[PDB]
Amino acid sequence: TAPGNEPMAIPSDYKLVWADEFNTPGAPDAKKWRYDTSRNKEGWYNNELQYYAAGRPENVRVENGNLVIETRKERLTSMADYGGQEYSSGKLFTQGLADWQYGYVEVRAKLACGKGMWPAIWMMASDGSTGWPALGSIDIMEMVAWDPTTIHGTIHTKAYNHVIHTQKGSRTTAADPCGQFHTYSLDWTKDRMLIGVDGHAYMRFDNDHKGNHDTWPFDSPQYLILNVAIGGWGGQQGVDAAAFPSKMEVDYVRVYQK
Ligand SMILES: OC[C@H]1O[C@@H](O[C@H]2[C@H](O)[C@@H](O)[C@H](O[C@@H]3[C@@H](O)[C@@H](O)O[C@H](CO)[C@H]3O)O[C@@H]2CO)[C@H](O)[C@@H](O)[C@@H]1O
Ligand SMILES: [Ca+2]
């Protein structure tokens, strides 16, 4: 629904304005990432099966220059916010720490595989007053590991979203995404978004320039989100116990702006 076919690359006139190179082993940098626990006890959206553990190295850690988000089959019943889940995982976002209006986002990542796994690199608007989906969401990368070579790039707005099946997205494939790094990229300007892998946009979404927040909510800042969900879209061919633990490794997040 949002086909692209054009190169993409860090614009020559942009500077690197924000980066997490995951240089510092241990916990993620608290000045860059917060943990999202907001629906642990209730159950996450999308019929998701994971508990997202905050402050827990087994799920979220920096090692050897990479962020590691790791899913595990386990019941974290000692957690006050435990929601009865069979799995643990990690969700980090830059909410309240850093956000961007326009820019080139480049994330170099090795994905988490195993039927059930749903790694994602995405964004939501800092101003959520209009609620989901109207606020505007940018999926720079989703993969569901029943189809682990397929890379999905999607935007959601009030007009264009998955609840009403009008989401603007595309897909491509990439070599062994769980075994080798690729670059997952967004080029967002006032005119359009390109979403790509390894310097190729497979997804394009234009600003129609109608000043309709329903079709272009993207003239306000967005923060970045990294997670690995379990089940929902990831669970289309079940959740494979033998797949755990599974990890997404992120070498870096770099954000460029004019
Ligand atoms: O169902 C209404 C509730 O929606 C909440 O928002 C969720 C939404 O339900 C869920 O579908 C969505 O899922 C994300 C995808 O749209 C896509 O953007 O990729 C993400 C990464 O895979 C995936 O999580 O997430 C929305 C935000 O959590 C509202 O938060 C809630 O107020 C509302 O009642
Ligand atoms: Ca690194």
Residue numbers in the entry: 8 to 265
Q: What does the report in the manuscript say about this coordinate set?
A:
Although we did not manage to obtain the apo form of the mutated enzyme, the structures of SCLamE144S cocrystallized with five different substrates, BGB, BGC, C3, C6, and L6, were solved. It is surprising that, in all structures of enzyme-ligand complexes, except for SCLamE144S/L6, clear electron densities confirm the presence of a 1,3-β-D-cellobiosyl-glucose (G3), where the β-1,3 linkage is located at the reducing end, from subsite −3 to −1. In contrast, SCLamE144S/BGB and SCLamE144S/BGC do not have a clear electron density at positive subsites. Coincidentally, ITC curves from BGB and BGC were fitted to a single-site binding model. The SCLamE144S showed a 100-fold higher affinity to BGB than to BGC. This result is in contrast to the activity assays where the enzyme displays stronger preference for BGC over BGB. In summary, BGB may have high affinity to bind into negative subsites, thus preventing cleavage, whereas the BGC structure leads to optimal binding for hydrolysis. The presence of the same ligand (G3) in most structures, even when the enzyme was cocrystallized with cello-oligosaccharides, indicates a high affinity of G3 for this site. It is also noteworthy that all SCLamE144S structures have an α-anomeric glycan in subsite −1.
